[PDB]
């Protein structure tokens, strides 16, 4: 009838953040050291962290030590785990544990645990983008559009910085697809179209990416 | 339970100005009320508690008054570092509330949008994607209302706006619309046109073209 229920969980990049909660039915968590365990792709589990009754003690492997915390909520019994600067070996199904049943000593096993919650981390942390023209056609408008790369931000000159009156650079959309989109535009006299020629010069240091797009009719 | 109206919704002024933005409760409240400036991307700061005293730090040229149900935020001689929106709150010893923000912005006459439709590069339609995109350029006031309309087909769901801040020469605003589509889909339709609405528009005005010249 004792059970546990892991949540959050889900896709990272490389470097993020991503908190775990474990709720629990049938019992207290109050009397009880609570666990963090992990079971990796090759078959294994993985021991992650404890933490003691009234947090006297929390522990983790030294994989983690330093990037996870663990947490405790004996009133609404809950129990945390942070992981911040994420790595693809903590690629993982986690499962939170209660050490000890009725059957409570000074040193129990793992008595009872969670049907356990995906976490993957994809290993790259960054992501360059395509970077599409926004073609022309008194005054005319043109751009670029700067799509699909993570995380922010992104830069974008025009004409290598020459150019900078009539230039509008909007704020970063993030899409349902979890990459950030923008566009840059820029108004011209539109006589100067045929003549001059316009490059949006796109820079994303996380990727140490630059792309130079030439804008024409 | 307590709400706070706050009024105006914008508030539009000069450099120089004072200004009054007030917040009305729904039950008397004493001086339980904290007024914070918030700028895009930045957490809230707060300037004024117990209605009426200024936090340290906070300059002079802003105070408050009230209480009961009526409160005043005044900023006398606006200051460029000034534009930004303001919150009034009920606090009370376990919750909270808040009346809905006021802008506060740089005034100017009214603008409407220059509008331009922008067809999916080549490049990317034959990556599977088409992005079509619409440029509301140099209005104001802010809002604005696009619609995309495909052979004629009222759109929804398909689409995702930004908004600049106001331009630092001009004071107007841009606003920018995608609307995506994958390459199957944009292939099967001919006229795709961005269609625009605006204070400063006596109708919508509409932008378009048809898929491949
Ligand atoms: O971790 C030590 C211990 O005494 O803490 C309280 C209960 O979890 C017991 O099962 C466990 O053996």
């Known amino acids: 009838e004792v059970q546990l229920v892991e949540s959050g969980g889900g896709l990272v990049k490389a470097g993020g953040s991503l908190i775990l909660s474990c709720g629990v039915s049938?019992?207290?968590?109050?009397?009880?050291?609570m666990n963090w365990v992990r079971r990796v792709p090759g078959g294994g589990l993985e021991w992650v962290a404890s933490?003691?009754?009234?947090?006297?003690?929390?522990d983790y492997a030294d994989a983690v030590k330093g990037r996870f915390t663990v947490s405790r909520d004996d009133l609404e019994d809950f129990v945390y785990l942070q992981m911040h600067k994420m790595r693809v070996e903590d690629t993982a199904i986690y499962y939170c544990?209660?050490?000890?049943?009725?059957?409570?000593?000074?040193?129990?096993?793992?008595?009872?645990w969670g049907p356990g919650t995906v976490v993957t981390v994809s290993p790259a942390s960054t992501k360059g983008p395509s970077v599409f023209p926004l073609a022309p056609s008194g005054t005319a408008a043109l751009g670029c559009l700067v799509k699909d790369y993570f995380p922010e931000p992104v830069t974008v000159s025009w004409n290598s910085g020459a150019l900078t009156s009539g230039v509008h650079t909007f704020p970063a959309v993030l899409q349902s697809s979890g990459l950030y989109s923008l566009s840059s535009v820029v108004t011209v006299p539109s006589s100067s179209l045929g003549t001059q020629t316009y490059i949006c010069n796109v820079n994303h240091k996380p990727s140490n990416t630059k792309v130079d797009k030439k804008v024409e009719p | 339970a307590v709400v706070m109206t706050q009024s105006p919704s914008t508030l539009s002024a000069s450099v120089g100005d004072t200004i009054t933005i007030t917040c009305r409760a729904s039950q008397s409240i004493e001086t339980w009320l904290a007024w914070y400036q918030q700028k895009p991307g930045k957490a809230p700061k707060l300037l004024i508690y117990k209605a009426s005293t200024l936090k340290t730090g906070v300059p002079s040229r802003f105070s408050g008054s009230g209480s009961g149900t009526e409160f005043t935020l005044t900023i006398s001689g606006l200051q460029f570092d000034d534009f930004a929106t303001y919150h009034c709150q009920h606090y009370a010893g376990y919750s909270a509330t808040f009346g809905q923000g006021t802008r506060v912005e740089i005034k100017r006459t009214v603008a409407a949008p220059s509008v331009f439709i922008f067809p999916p590069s080549d490049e990317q339609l034959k990556s599977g994607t088409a992005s079509v995109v619409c440029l509301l350029n140099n209005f104001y006031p802010r809002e604005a209302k696009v619609q995309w309309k495909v052979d004629n087909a009222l759109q929804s769901g398909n689409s995702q706006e930004s908004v600049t801040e106001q331009d630092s020469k001009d004071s107007t605003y841009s606003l920018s619309s995608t609307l995506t589509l994958s390459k199957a889909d944009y292939e099967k339709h001919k006229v795709y046109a961005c269609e625009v609405t605006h204070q400063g528009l006596s109708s919508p005005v509409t932008k378009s073209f048809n898929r491949g010249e």
């Open positions: 049938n019992f207290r968590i109050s009397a009880h050291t």
């Open positions: 544990a209660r050490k000890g049943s009725d059957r409570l000593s000074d040193n129990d096993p793992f008595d009872a």
């Open positions: 933490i003691s009754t009234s947090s006297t003690y929390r």
